[PDB]
């Protein structure tokens, strides 16, 4: 009965191909037998123009559960990103990605990726998900700038 | 006072080109 999840994901994929935000990527993976696996998407988020993230294209995996769209997907950067609100594991911590908070079934994959893009240059320092990014951000913004710029350069298309 | 004007595509097709020939 999880076929509800697959029906909605194919619908998301369908819409994405016709109309997706410029510079973004979101492609379902394929099982060993060459068929689509709509439960595991390989995605990429471009840094927003006018920020230190500009020019970088950051790879992110979107893992869906069978109760989707009741539940949000898990979004993990691969590799894990240097960012205050990204766990060491690469999992993005954002309210719209939490079933108990701001998530709701209507939210599209497009909105998810746009949300994470917004997060990149607007971190929540009061509630960090990792220690490294928080520390550098608070003690040395010059070093933070360098790290972000370097990170974006490393992940340029 | 508010008044609706129009609702259209954010990125409309500007031009159509035919490569079938």
């Amino acid at each position: 009965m999880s076929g509800i999840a697959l029906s909605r994901l194919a619908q998301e994929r369908r819409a994405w191909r016709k109309d997706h935000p410029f510079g973004f990527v979101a492609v379902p993976t394929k099982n060993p037998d060459g068929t689509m696996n709509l439960m595991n998407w390989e995605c990429a988020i471009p840094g927003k123009k006018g920020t230190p993230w500009e020019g970088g294209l950051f790879k992110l995996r979107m893992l869906f559960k069978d109760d989707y769209p009741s539940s949000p997907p898990k979004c993990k950067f691969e590799p894990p990103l240097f960012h205050p609100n990204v766990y060491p594991s690469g999992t993005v911590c954002l309210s719209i990605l939490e079933e108990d908070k701001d998530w709701r079934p209507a939210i599209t994959i497009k909105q998810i990726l746009l949300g994470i893009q917004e997060l990149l240059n607007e971190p929540n320092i009061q509630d960090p998900a990792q220690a490294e990014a928080y520390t550098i951000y608070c003690q040395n913004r010059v070093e933070y700038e360098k790290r972000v710029r370097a990170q974006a350069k490393k992940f340029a298309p | 006072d508010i008044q609706f004007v129009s609702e259209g595509p954010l990125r409309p097709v500007l031009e159509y080109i035919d490569l079938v020939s």
Partner: protein, 76 residues
């Protein structure tokens, strides 16, 4: 003047509004049309968060400028 509302669904809704009427009215109007709420959505002009009590005047808005819609969120 005319003001465009750029959404996240690939569409733009255009409204005509007086130069000194708060955008609070435009907000609840757009929401009313797309069946959205205002807790879930936020608005911005040229990158700056819009307050409900702002009119096109003090924000120096002109004819056929664009308001951008975004899903409310916060990292953690």
């Amino acid at each position: 003047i005319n003001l465009k509302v750029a959404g996240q669904d690939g569409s733009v809704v255009q409204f005509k509004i007086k130069r000194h009427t708060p955008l609070s009215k435009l907000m609840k109007a757009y929401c009313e049309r797309q069946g959205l709420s205002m807790r879930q959505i936020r608005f911005r002009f040229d990158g700056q968060p819009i307050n409900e009590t702002d009119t096109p005047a003090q924000l120096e808005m002109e004819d056929e400028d664009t308001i951008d819609v975004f899903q409310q969120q916060t990292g953690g």
